[PDB]
Write a protein that binds this ligand. Structure first.
Ligand code: HEM
Ligand code: HEM
Ligand SMILES: Nc1nc2c(c(=O)[nH]1)N[C@@H](CNc1ccc(C(=O)N[C@@H](CCC(=O)O)C(=O)O)cc1)CN2
Ligand SMILES: Nc1nc2c(c(=O)[nH]1)N[C@@H](CNc1ccc(C(=O)N[C@@H](CCC(=O)O)C(=O)O)cc1)CN2
Ligand SMILES: NC(=[NH2+])NCCC[C@H](N)C(=O)O
Ligand SMILES: NC(=[NH2+])NCCC[C@H](N)C(=O)O
Lengths: 361, 361
């Protein structure tokens, strides 16, 4: 009924905009007629290799919360709409990790899995990120942010060693199955970086480490009415995501007091700004460590400078800029970046990546 | 017409809410009848000493952009609705600086001047803050943020020494005068704090200083339909306002590179996070210097902790909390405070302080 109507309206808007940017404005008429016939025949339509490649790229370009958008057009799109089995999905996820890692020289990539047909999913990825650490709760072990997913993996037969850095398994559900399946990640495929400091030798005593590639696997890619619920993507890390959030937040690894102790400063007074000094050294340490191991990473000052060039290029291309200031500003020294000193329109423009309900909560 | 209607509607809402908090719910009926008779007779109404005192307090409590709201009920309200001459306004502004400074032990205060009667102002303060530094532009001298006001003061006969820290004069306009008048601030009345560091001796070479009390003098206080366009207020500084903004912003004093040089670190690479380290030391220096001189100041961690207790007390009192996250989060280490990790409703609740158009721009 109204589902076939919304699908056709978003398809008309996408094909026109997509082909206008690709320099194929005259091919819009014939393509839109074939799509109308396909929606009436099947109830959906299949994108061409050029369409979803540019659709995933436009989706990144429209991602309000992303500071790394300057590199939108260099996205490596892997088409895996041919997957049928759980082994095919596993192989595709393993391949994504390998090719995106690229021995440290991270390539921004996205793997496109089959979309939803009649509202129901073909492949459903439960992982927040393909590579992530487990969390347990006596006292707190691991990543608190992963507690509910870890509990879901354990209810399926998986069991972790209970260290602070247990790699979660790949957990996904195929159409036809009531429950998901899990696969342990091969250690050779996952690059991890131990955290050391350039000047302070004692920093290694903290025994901190983090994985190299952030691969968000639970967001829905929407391209012209077509819902790609399973479409894992990755860029490289901005240092602050690890040193100012993952390892610093009270509800995460909460390492600021321990960092303050190894760098030789007191945790006695708020006025001494020990949390600030600890944040600076931990963040300097993360950038140094990744660089030493040859794993791509960017600092917040360089990332903001790259983002300014994105703002300039969008105005030069004639497109409106959309952004979410609350997410674009870095968690440390935001006022030292141009982002803090300007405003952004938080309007949602399609194609884009959206949040979807967690099947384990 | 509609002006007498809006005035009566806001008066009804204020008196009911004001007396409900003061425990005088039965006195609402008789007071509202006297106010109706006054609006029909004069076209406005005069607040009692208890009314505007609590009105200014509620206005601070409703200030979305303020982190120091825990101390709302301790506000020192000075009633200067009796001022008639330029000398009376000058004496009142001089007195506000003196009593608010209180030899360093800063008292949060507000001076209430006569409100607008028929849309026209009785006293119009041009200063953004009662104590502020001049700005000129060859090269840049002083505070760039004060350029337009400094130009306005110079067009009136004032002339500064052209140092980086010239105190702007008090500049205000009386009803009946086409142009404003100016008065130079006596040096004895203005407390200034030289910036030194606790561990780094060379920090004094930067010759940085700032004034002790931030007295915002260009905002409009609105209490029950009555517009107090001239109502200067002050609290004490949160360290970051000086060390992370006033002395750090590129469009302000822009001292980060100079700070990095005196603390012995290189400005070569973004990855070394020199801006972050410079921010930490400059901010540690500001807190130390004010404390050494006995001038009240608060760090961002303690201020956020005080603000959390405000959130708790408002829920315990039965009032809805309103806030502007973009302004409540500190400019350095925001993720180390609870503010960053929650949401706030940015709804405007009256009584409040509002921005008004600048008469010099
Ligand atoms: C090239 C390197 C990249 C960098 C430096 C970068 C950086 C960032 C940062 C700092 C955030 C905030 C993360 C957080 O606070 O949790 C973010 C969010 C986001 N990024 Fe990017 N990104 C990159 C690539 C990508 C790619 C390849 C895509 C899409 C194809 C993308 C899509 C998004 C989206 C949708 C969000 C929001 C996620 C959420 O709401 O949780 N990013 N990015
Ligand atoms: C007791 C100490 C106080 C502290 C620690 C405090 C702190 C702050 C801070 C950090 C800001 C942001 C300033 C900026 O970024 O420019 C602010 C804004 C503000 N404060 Fe407070 N404050 C205090 C007292 C007061 C008082 C006494 C009033 C009112 C009677 C008040 C009214 C406001 C308002 C209206 C704003 C917004 C100003 C604007 O929009 O430019 N504050 N305060
Ligand atoms: N303490 C304090 N904080 C501040 C400033 C300050 O002087 N003091 N100055 C500010 C600089 N000016 C603004 C004002 C408003 C907004 C703003 O509103 N921004 C978002 C809102 C985004 C969103 O809702 O997603 C936007 O992009 O439109 C941004 C910068 C920022 N924060
Ligand atoms: N990089 C990055 N930035 C972040 C988060 C992140 O994970 N990554 N996590 C965020 C924590 N969660 C939120 C999400 C939205 C809002 C938000 O919307 N806040 C304002 C908006 C205020 C206003 O408009 O004035 C509010 O108070 O309602 C606040 C915190 C904040 N910023
Ligand atoms: N740089 C990126 N693409 N980040 C995506 C989100 C990663 C998340 N913030 C993390 O710390 O794991
Ligand atoms: N703590 C306060 N009451 N601040 C009011 C604003 C002061 C302004 N931010 C300044 O740096 O001068």
């Amino acid at each position: 009924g109204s589902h076939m109507e919304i699908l056709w309206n978003e398809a008309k808007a996408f094909i026109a905009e997509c082909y206008q940017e690709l320099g194929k404005e005259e091919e819009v008429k014939d393509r839109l007629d074939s799509i109308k016939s396909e929606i009436d025949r099947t109830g959906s339509y299949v994108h061409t290799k050029e369409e979803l490649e540019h659709g995933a790229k436009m989706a990144w370009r429209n991602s309000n919360r992303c500071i790394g958008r300057l590199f939108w057009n260099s996205l490596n799109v892997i088409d895996r709409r041919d997957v049928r089995t759980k082994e095919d999905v596993r192989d595709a996820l393993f391949h994504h990790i390998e090719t995106a890692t690229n021995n440290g020289k991270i390539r921004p990539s996205i793997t496109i899995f089959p979309p939803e047909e009649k509202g129901e999913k073909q492949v459903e990825i439960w992982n927040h990120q393909l590579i992530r650490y487990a969390g347990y709760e006596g006292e707190r072990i691991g990543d608190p942010a992963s507690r509910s997913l870890t509990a879901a993996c354990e209810q399926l037969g998986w069991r972790g060693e209970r260290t602070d850095f247990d790699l979660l398994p790949l957990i996904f559900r195929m159409r036809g199955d009531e429950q998901p399946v899990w696969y342990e990640l091969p250690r050779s495929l996952v690059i991890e970086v131990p955290i050391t400091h350039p000047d302070i030798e004692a920093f290694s005593d903290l025994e901190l480490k983090w994985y190299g590639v952030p691969i968000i696997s639970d967001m829905k890619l929407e391209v012209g009415g077509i819902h790609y619920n399973a479409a894992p993507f990755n860029g490289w890390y901005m240092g602050t995501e690890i040193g100012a959030r993952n390892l610093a937040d009270e509800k995460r690894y909460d390492k600021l007091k321990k960092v303050a102790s190894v760098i030789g400063i007191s945790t006695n007074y708020n006025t001494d700004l020990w949390k600030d000094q600890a944040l600076v050294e931990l963040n300097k340490a993360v950038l140094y460590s990744y660089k030493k191991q040859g794993v791509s990473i960017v600092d917040h000052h360089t990332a903001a400078s790259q983002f300014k060039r994105f703002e300039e290029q969008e105005e030069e291309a004639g497109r409106k800029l959309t952004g979410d200031w609350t997410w674009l500003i870095p968690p440390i020294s935001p006022a030292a970046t141009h982002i803090f000193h300007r405003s952004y329109d938080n309007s949602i423009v399609k194609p884009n990546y959206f949040y979807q309900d967690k099947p384990y909560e």
